[PDB]
Amino acid sequence: DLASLAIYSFWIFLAGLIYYLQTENMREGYPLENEDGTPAANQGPFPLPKPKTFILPHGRGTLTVPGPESEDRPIALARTAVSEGFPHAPTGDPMKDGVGPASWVARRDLPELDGHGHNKIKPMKAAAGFHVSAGKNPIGLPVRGCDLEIAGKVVDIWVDIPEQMARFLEVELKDGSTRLLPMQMVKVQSNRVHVNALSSDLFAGIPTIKSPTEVTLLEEDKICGYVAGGLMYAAPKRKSVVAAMLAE
Amino acid sequence: ALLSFERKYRVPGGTLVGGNLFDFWVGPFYVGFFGVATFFFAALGIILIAWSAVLQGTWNPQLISVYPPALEYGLGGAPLAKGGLWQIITICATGAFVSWALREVEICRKLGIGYHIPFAFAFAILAYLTLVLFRPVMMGAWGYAFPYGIWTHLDWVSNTGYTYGNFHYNPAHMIAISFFFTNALALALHGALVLSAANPEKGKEMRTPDHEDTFFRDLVGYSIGTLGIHRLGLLLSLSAVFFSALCMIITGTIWFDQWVDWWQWWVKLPWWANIPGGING
Amino acid sequence: YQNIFSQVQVRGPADLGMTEDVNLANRSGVGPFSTLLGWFGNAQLGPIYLGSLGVLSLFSGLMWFFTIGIWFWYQAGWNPAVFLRDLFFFSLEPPAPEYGLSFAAPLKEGGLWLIASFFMFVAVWSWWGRTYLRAQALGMGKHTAWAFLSAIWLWMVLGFIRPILMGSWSEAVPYGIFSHLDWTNNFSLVHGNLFYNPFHGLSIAFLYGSALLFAMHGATILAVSRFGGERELEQIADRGTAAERAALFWRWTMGFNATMEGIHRWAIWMAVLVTLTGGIGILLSGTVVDNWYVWGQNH
Numbered sequence: 018d019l020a021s022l023a024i025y026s027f028w029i030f031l032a033g034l035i036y037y038l039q040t041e042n043m044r045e046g047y048p049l050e051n052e053d054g055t056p057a058a059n060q061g062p063f064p065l066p067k068p069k070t071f072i073l074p075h076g077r078g079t080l081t082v083p084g085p086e087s088e089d090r091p092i093a094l095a096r097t098a099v100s101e102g103f104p105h106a107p108t109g110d111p112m113k114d115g116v117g118p119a120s121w122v123a124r125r126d127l128p129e130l131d132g133h134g135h136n137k138i139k140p141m142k143a144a145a146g147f148h149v150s151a152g153k154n155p156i157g158l159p160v161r162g163c164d165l166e167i168a169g170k171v172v173d174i175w176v177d178i179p180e181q182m183a184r185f186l187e188v189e190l191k192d193g194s195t196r197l198l199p200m201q202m203v204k205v206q207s208n209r210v211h212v213n214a215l216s217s218d219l220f221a222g223i224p225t226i227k228s229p230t231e232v233t234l235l236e237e238d239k240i241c242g243y244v245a246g247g248l249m250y251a252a253p254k255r256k257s258v259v260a261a262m263l264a265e
Numbered sequence: 266a267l268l269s270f271e272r273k274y275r276v277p278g279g280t281l282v283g284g285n286l287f288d289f290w291v292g293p294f295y296v297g298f299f300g301v302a303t304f305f306f307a308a309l310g311i312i313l314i315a316w317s318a319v320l321q322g323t324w325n326p327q328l329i330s331v332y333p334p335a336l337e338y339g340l341g342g343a344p345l346a347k348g349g350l351w352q353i354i355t356i357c358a359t360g361a362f363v364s365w366a367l368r369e370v371e372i373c374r375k376l377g378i379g380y381h382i383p384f385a386f387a388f389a390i391l392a393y394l395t396l397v398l399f400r401p402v403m404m405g406a407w408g409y410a411f412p413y414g415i416w417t418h419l420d421w422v423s424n425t426g427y428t429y430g431n432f433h434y435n436p437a438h439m440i441a442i443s444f445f446f447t448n449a450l451a452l453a454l455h456g457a458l459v460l461s462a463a464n465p466e467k468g469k470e471m472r473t474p475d476h477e478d479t480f481f482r483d484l485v486g487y488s489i490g491t492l493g494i495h496r497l498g499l500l501l502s503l504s505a506v507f508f509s510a511l512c513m514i515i516t517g518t519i520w521f522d523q524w525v526d527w528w529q530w531w532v533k534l535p536w537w538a539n540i541p542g543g544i545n546g
Numbered sequence: 547y548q549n550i551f552s553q554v555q556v557r558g559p560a561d562l563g564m565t566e567d568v569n570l571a572n573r574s575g576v577g578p579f580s581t582l583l584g585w586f587g588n589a590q591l592g593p594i595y596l597g598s599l600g601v602l603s604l605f606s607g608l609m610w611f612f613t614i615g616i617w618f619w620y621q622a623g624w625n626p627a628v629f630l631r632d633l634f635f636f637s638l639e640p641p642a643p644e645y646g647l648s649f650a651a652p653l654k655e656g657g658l659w660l661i662a663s664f665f666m667f668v669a670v671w672s673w674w675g676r677t678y679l680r681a682q683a684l685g686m687g688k689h690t691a692w693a694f695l696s697a698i699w700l701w702m703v704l705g706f707i708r709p710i711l712m713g714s715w716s717e718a719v720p721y722g723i724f725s726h727l728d729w730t731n732n733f734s735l736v737h738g739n740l741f742y743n744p745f746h747g748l749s750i751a752f753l754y755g756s757a758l759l760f761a762m763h764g765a766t767i768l769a770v771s772r773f774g775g776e777r778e779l780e781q782i783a784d785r786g787t788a789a790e791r792a793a794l795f796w797r798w799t800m801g802f803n804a805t806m807e808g809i810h811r812w813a814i815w816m817a818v819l820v821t822l823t824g825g826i827g828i829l830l831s832g833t834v835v836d837n838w839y840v841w842g843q844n845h
C-alpha cells in the first residue's frame with residue numbers, strides 16, 4: 018500500500034533530519050567538558066559534524082566551526098562542592114570579573130561592520146542624516162539608577178546606520194566622562210530615562226570604549242554583560258515599586 | 266556535562282523560592298525549587314494516568330484515555346474512574362506547567378536575560394486552561410473539557426466542532442487560523458533569510474543584515490528588520506493562541522447555535538438586507 | 547523595558563541598498579516612511595525591484611483577482627450593496643464533473659474558474675522565479691526559493707495535481723471565502739475524516755510546532771536583545787554572550803540547546819514540513835486512499 022509506505026519512509030526521513038539538525042547545533046559549545054575543563058566522558062549520542070568554513074567580509078578572515086574553543090580569559094569563580102553539579106561562586110566581584118550574569122565573551126575587538134565596510138554603530142552626531150523621527154527624545158534627560166539617584170545625563174543616541182535604530186544611549190557621568198547604555202535596558206520616561214539594572218554608584222564601573230566614536234564588539238559585549246549583571250548584583254541597592262512612585 | 270562556554274554562568278543565585286538548597290544542576294538540566302515541584306507534579310500525573318489505564322483495562326497508547334466528569338457530575342467533585350481521576354490529573358498537569366514556566370523565570374534570572382520565554386509559554390498554559398477549566402466553568406460542567414488520550418481527544422474536537430455545524434465559520438477561529446498560517450509563513454521566511462545570508466552561494470563571503478533588508482525590500486518592497494521579525498514571530502504565535510482560546514471560550518456560552526448562522530447579522534443588516542440578487546437575496 | 551515596541555524612533559537617509567549584481571535600473575525609488583510601522587519594525591517602505599518576472603507576476607496576479615472580482619460582480623448583479631453584503635458568500639466554482647480535465651466548459655459554468663486558475667498558476671510560479679533570482683543577484687543562498695516550494699506544493703496538489711490524477715476539474719477548490727471553507731469541510735467528510743489521515747496529524751504537528759518554535763525563538767532573541775541578540779549573523783560569525791545565554795537557557799531548561807546559525811535550520815524545517823507533509827496527505831486522499839478511517843483500521 019502506497020500511503021503506508023509513504024508514512025513509513027517519512028519517519029525514516031524525520032529521524033535522519035532530527036539527526037542532521039542536532040549535529041548542526043553542535044557546531045559551538047561542544048565537545049562537552051567536565052567542570053574542570055578536561056573532556057567529559059558522556060559525549061552524547063550524536064557525532065560532532067565535519068568543519069564548515071565561513072568567509073568573513075572586509076578582512077575579518079574566516080570561521081571554522083567546530084574548532085578549538087575560543088575561551089581563554091581568566092574566569093574568577095571557585096567550585097562550591099566536591100561533586101559535579103554545583104554552583105561556582107565568584108572569587109571576587111562578579112561585575113568586575115565578567116562572571117555570571119555579568120559574563121561577556123571575548124568577541125573580536127573591532128566594530129561590527131555594515132554592507133559597505135563602515136561601522137554599523139556610530140554616535141548620532143556623526144551619523145549623517147540621522148535624527149529622532151518619533152517618540153520622546155532622551156538626549157539631554159537626567160538618567161536615574163535603581164537607588165533612585167541621578168546617575169548621569171544622556172548626551173547622544175548611538176545609532177545603527179544600516180538598520181536605522183537606537184542601539185545605545187551615551188551617558189555623561191558626574192565627572193564629565195561617558196558611557197554606553199544598551200537601549201533595550203533603559204526606559205525613556207518623559208522627564209527622565211530610568212536604568213533599573215544599575216544603581217548610580219555602579220555607573221562608573223561600566224566598561225569604557227577606547228576610541229570615542231566607535232564601539233568594538235568586545236566592548237559591547239563587555240558593556241551589555243555588566244549592565245545585565247546588575248539585575249542580580251545591584252539588587253541590595255534597588256528600591257522597590259513602592260519607593261519609585263513615592264519618588265514623585 | 267558542561268558546554269565549553271557554560272562554566273562562567275553556573276554562578277549561584279536567581280532563585281524565586283528556596284535560597285541555595287535547590288540551586289544545583291542534574292547534568293544539563295537546572296533543578297531549582299520549581300524543578301522539584303515540576304517533577305512531583307509530573308510523576309504524580311503519569312502514575313494517576315497509569316491508574317486510568319488499569320481501571321479501564323488497556324496498556325496501549327492509542328486506547329488509554331481518561332475521561333472528564335460526565336454532565337451529571339456538573340462542576341463539583343466526582344468519583345475516581347467516573348471522571349474524578351481526570352480531575353486530579355488536571356490539577357497535576359496545571360501545577361507541572363506553571364512550575365515549568367516558573368522554573369524558567371529562575372533560569373532567566375540566573376542568566377540576566379528577559380522573562381520572555383515564560384511569558385510566551387503562559388499563553389499556551391492559558392489556552393489549555395481555557396479548554397480544561399475556564400470554559401467548563403462557564404458552561405456549568407467538567408464534562409465539556411477534552412479527554413486525555415491521543416485519539417479520543419481528536420474525537421473530542423470533531424464532536425465539539427460539529428455541534429456548531431462547520432466550526433470554520435467561527436469568526437475568532439478564522440482569526441486564529443490566520444495567525445497560525447501567517448506565523449508558519451513568517452517562520453519559513455525568517456529561517457530561510459538568515460540561512461541564505463549565512464550560507465550564501467558557495468565561494469562568497471557571508472552576507473550581512475543589509476543584504477537581508479535588501480532581499481526583502483527587493484522581493485516584497487518591505488523589510489521589517491532583524492528585530493521586527495522576532496517581535497513579529499512572538500506576536501503571531503501568541504496572537505494565534507490568544508484568538509484560538511478566545512473562539513472556544515465564546516462558544517457554548519455566548520453562542521450555542523450553528524456558527525454559520527452568526528454571519529446573518531451582516532446580511533439581515535437593514536438597507537441592503539432586502540434587495541433581491543446575490544446569494545442571500 | 548521589554549523591546550516589544552521601540553521606545554525612540556531614529557531615522558536616516560533612505561537606504562537604497564546593497565548593490566552586488568542587482569540590476570539597479572530595475573530598482574524603484576524610495577517609498578514613504580511610516581512612523582506606525584516604525585514602532586514595531588523598520589520604518590522605510592521600499593525600494594522594490596520590478597524586473598520582467600516581477601511585472602509578469604504582478605499582471606497575472608492582478609488578472610486572477612480581476613477574474614474572481616468580475617464573476618462576483620456578475621453574481622452581485624452589478625449592484626454595489628449586494629456585492630458588499632455577500633462578498634463572502636460569492637464563489638467561482640470549477641467545471642462540473644461532466645467536463646473532466648477538458649477546457650470546454652461554458653464561461654459561467656467553470657470557464658472563468660479555469661481562466662482564474664491559469665492566471666494564478668503563472669502569477670505564483672513567476673513569483674517563485676523571482677524569489678530565486680533576487681537571491682542570486684545578491685549572491686545569497688536559495689533558501690527562500692526552496693521554502694516557497696513547500697508552500698507551492700500544497701497549493702499545487704489542492705488545485706492542479708490532485709484534480710489531474712482524479713480525472714476532473716470539479717475536484718479543485720472554488721474561489722470564494724466561505725465556499726473554500728465548505729470545500730475543506732466537505733473534503734474531510736467525503737474522505738472519511740481527515741483526523742485519521744497520518745499526514746494531516748503530522749501537518750498539524752508542524753503547524754502547532756511552528757507557533758511553538760517561533761514564540762520560543764522570537765522570545766529568546768527579544769530576551770537577549772540586551773546583548774545585541776537580534777544581530778544573529780554576527781553572532782554566527784563571532785559568538786557573543788547573547789548566543790551563549792540564549793543557548794544556555796534552553797540547555798538548562800529542556801536539556802539541549804542550539805546555535806545561532808542552527809536555530810534557523812530548525813525554524814525553516816519546522817515550517818517547511820507543514821505543507822510538505824500536508825501536501826502528501828491531500829495527494830494520497832481520493833487517489834490511493836478513499837477513506838482514512840478504513841485505511842486506519844488496516845494499520
Ligand code: BCL
Nearest residue numbers: 433438439440442443446447450485486701704719723730
Ligand atoms: C489549508 C486547507 C484549505 C484552507 C482552509 C482555510 C481555513 C480553515 C481558514 C482559511 C483561511 C484563509 N485562507 Mg485558506 N485554505 C486552503 C487554501 C487557500 C489558498 C490557496 C490558493 O491555497 C489561499 C490563498 C487561501 C487563503 C486564505 C485566506 C483568504 C484566509 C486567511 C489565512 C491566510 O491566508 O494566511 C495569511 C497569510 C498572509 C498574511 C500572507 C501575506 C503576506 C504579506 C502580509 C506580506 C507583504 C507583501 C504582500 C502584500 C505582496 C507584496 C508585493 C507588493 C504589493 C508590491 N486558502 C485549503 C483549501 N483557509 C481562514 C479564513 O479566515 O477564512 C475565511 C480560515 O479560517
Ligand code: BCL
Nearest residue numbers: 697698700701730731733734746749750753824825827828
Ligand atoms: C472539517 C475540516 C477538516 C480539515 C480539513 C483539511 C483539509 C481539506 C486540508 C487541511 C489541511 C490542514 N489542516 Mg485541517 N481539517 C480539520 C481540522 C484541523 C485542525 C483542527 C484543530 O481540528 C487543525 C489544526 C488543522 C490544521 C491543518 C493544517 C495543518 C493543514 C494546512 C496547512 C497550511 O498551513 O496550509 C496553508 C498553506 C497553503 C494553502 C499554501 C499557500 C500557497 C501559496 C502559493 C499561495 C499564494 C496566494 C496568492 C495567490 C494570494 C496572495 C495574497 C496577498 C498577500 C494579499 N485542521 C477538519 C478535520 N485540513 C490541508 C492539508 O495540508 O491537509 C493535510 C488541507 O488541504
Ligand code: BCL
Nearest residue numbers: 389390392393422423425426431432433441442509510513
Ligand atoms: C472537525 C472540527 C472542526 C474544528 C474544531 C475545533 C475545536 C473544537 C477546537 C479547535 C481548535 C483549534 N482549531 Mg479547529 N476545527 C476545524 C478545522 C480547523 C482548521 C482547518 C484548516 O480546517 C484549522 C487550521 C483549525 C485550527 C484550530 C486552532 C486555531 C485551534 C487549535 C490551536 C490551539 O488551541 O492551541 C492551544 C494550544 C494548547 C492548548 C497546547 C497546551 C500545551 C500545554 C501547555 C503543554 C503540554 C506539555 C506536554 C504535555 C509536555 C510533554 C513533553 C513531552 C513528554 C516531550 N481548525 C474543524 C472544522 N478546532 C481548539 C481551540 O480553539 O482551542 C483553544 C479547539 O478547542
Ligand code: BCL
Nearest residue numbers: 311393396411415418419422746747748750751754755758
Ligand atoms: C489544540 C486543540 C486540541 C488538540 C488538537 C489536536 C489535533 C487536531 C491534532 C493533535 C495532535 C497532537 N496533540 Mg493535541 N490538542 C489539544 C491539546 C493537547 C495537549 C494538551 C496538554 O493540551 C497535548 C499534550 C496534546 C498533544 C498532542 C500530540 C500527541 C499530537 C501532536 C501535536 C504536536 O506535536 O504539537 C506540537 C508540539 C510539539 C512538536 C512539542 C512536542 C510535544 C509532544 C509531541 C507531546 C507528546 C505527548 C504524549 C503523547 C502525551 C504526554 C503524556 C505523558 C505521560 C507526559 N494536544 C487540544 C484539545 N492535537 C495531532 C495528532 O493527534 O496526531 C498525532 C493532531 O492531528
Ligand SMILES: CC[C@H]1c2cc3[nH]c4c(c3C)C(=O)[C@H](C(=O)OC)c4c3nc(cc4[nH]c(cc(n2)[C@@H]1C)c(C(C)=O)c4C)[C@@H](C)[C@@H]3CCC(=O)OC/C=C(\C)CCC[C@@H](C)CCC[C@@H](C)CCCC(C)C
Nearest residue numbers: 446449450453603604607669670673693694696697817818
Ligand atoms: C512553508 C509553508 C508556509 C509558506 C511559505 C512561504 N510563502 C511564501 C514564501 C514562503 C517560504 C515566499 O518566499 C513567498 C514570499 O515572497 O513571501 C512574502 C511566499 C508567499 N506566500 C504567500 C501567501 C500565502 N502563503 C501561505 C502559507 C504558507 N506559506 C505556509 C505557512 C498562505 C496561507 C493561505 O496560509 C498564503 C495566503 C504570498 C504572499 C507570497 C507569494 C506571492 C505570489 O506568488 O503572489 C503573486 C500574486 C500577486 C503578485 C498578486 C498581486 C495582488 C495585487 C492586489 C497587488 C497590488 C499592489 C499595489 C496596490 C501596491 C504596490 C505597487 C508597487 C508598484 C510598489
Ligand SMILES: CC[C@H]1c2cc3[nH]c4c(c3C)C(=O)[C@H](C(=O)OC)c4c3nc(cc4[nH]c(cc(n2)[C@@H]1C)c(C(C)=O)c4C)[C@@H](C)[C@@H]3CCC(=O)OC/C=C(\C)CCC[C@@H](C)CCC[C@H](C)CCCC(C)C
Nearest residue numbers: 307310358361362365385386389414415506754757758761
Ligand atoms: C505561545 C503558544 C505556543 C507555545 C509556546 C511554548 N511552548 C513551550 C514554551 C513556549 C514559549 C516553552 O518554554 C516550553 C518549552 O520548554 O519548550 C520546549 C514549551 C512547551 N510546550 C510544549 C508542548 C506543546 N505546546 C503546544 C503549543 C504551543 N506552545 C503554542 C503554539 C502544544 C500543542 C499545540 O499541542 C504542545 C503539545 C512542551 C513540549 C514544552 C514544555 C511544557 C512543560 O510544562 O513541560 C513540562 C512537562 C511535564 C513535567 C509533563 C507533565 C504532564 C504530565 C503531568 C501528564 C498530564 C497531562 C496530559 C499529558 C494531558 C494531555 C494528553 C494529550 C494526548 C491530549
Ligand SMILES: COC1=C(OC)C(=O)C(C/C=C(\C)CC/C=C(\C)CC/C=C(\C)CC/C=C(\C)CC/C=C(\C)CC/C=C(\C)CC/C=C(\C)CC/C=C(\C)CC/C=C(\C)CCC=C(C)C)=C(C)C1=O
Nearest residue numbers: 447450451454455458459477478481487488489490491494
Ligand atoms: C532576518 O530578518 C528578517 C527581516 O529583516 C531583515 C525581514 O524583513 C523579513 C521579512 C519579513 C517581513 C517583511 C514581514 C513578514 C510579514 C508577514 C509574513 C505577514 C504580516 C502580517 C501582519 C502585518 C499582520 C499583523 C496584524 C496587524 C498589522 C493588525 C493589527 C494588529 C493585530 C490584529 C494583532 C493584535 C491583536 C488585536 C489588535 C486584536 C485585539 C486584541 C485583544 C482583545 C488583546 C489585548 C488585550 C486587551 C485589548 C485588553 C484591554 C486592554 C486595553 C484596552 C489597553 C489600554 C489601551 C487603550 C487604548 C484603552 C524576514 C522574514 C526576516 O527574517
Ligand SMILES: COC1=C(OC)C(=O)C(C/C=C(\C)CC/C=C(\C)CC/C=C(\C)CC/C=C(\C)CC/C=C(\C)CC/C=C(\C)CC/C=C(\C)CC/C=C(\C)CC/C=C(\C)CCC=C(C)C)=C(C)C1=O
Nearest residue numbers: 291294759762763766792793796800803804805806809812
Ligand atoms: C537563538 O537562540 C535560541 C537557541 O539558542 C542558540 C535555542 O537553543 C533555542 C531552542 C530551540 C531548539 C533547541 C530547537 C528544537 C526544539 C523544538 C522544536 C521544541 C520541541 C522540543 C521538545 C518537545 C523537547 C521538550 C523537552 C522537555 C519537556 C524536557 C525533557 C525532560 C526530561 C527528559 C525529564 C526531566 C529530566 C531531568 C530533571 C534530568 C535527567 C536528565 C536527562 C533525561 C538527560 C539525558 C539525555 C540524553 C542521554 C539524550 C537523549 C537522546 C535522544 C532523546 C535521542 C533523539 C531521538 C531520536 C529518535 C534521534 C531557541 C528557541 C533559540 O531561540
Ligand SMILES: [Fe+2]
Nearest residue numbers: 459763767778
Ligand atoms: Fe532569528
